[PDB]
Amino acid sequence: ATCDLASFSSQWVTPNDSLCAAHCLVKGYRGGYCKNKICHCRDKF
Numbered sequence: 001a002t003c004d005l006a007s008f009s010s011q012w013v014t015p016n017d018s019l020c021a022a023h024c025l026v027k028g029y030r031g032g033y034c035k036n037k038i039c040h041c042r043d044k045f
Contacts, residue, residue: 002033003020003031003032003033003034003039004020004031004032004039005020005031006019006020006021006039007020007021007030007031008021008022008025010030018038019037019038019039020032020034020038020039020041023038023041024039024041027041027044028044028045029041029042029043029044029045030043030044030045031043
């Protein structure tokens with residue numbers, strides 16, 4: 001149950017809410033350990 005997924009609309013019908021995408025995408029990340037709800041990406045693409 002790692003929060004290393006939910007990369008926006010990659011494999012989810014995500015509308016805009018980052019969760020583990022949008023925020024990271026700004027820098028260029030797509031996966032990381034989650035805290036509370038938002039994943040703090042620790043891997044850049």
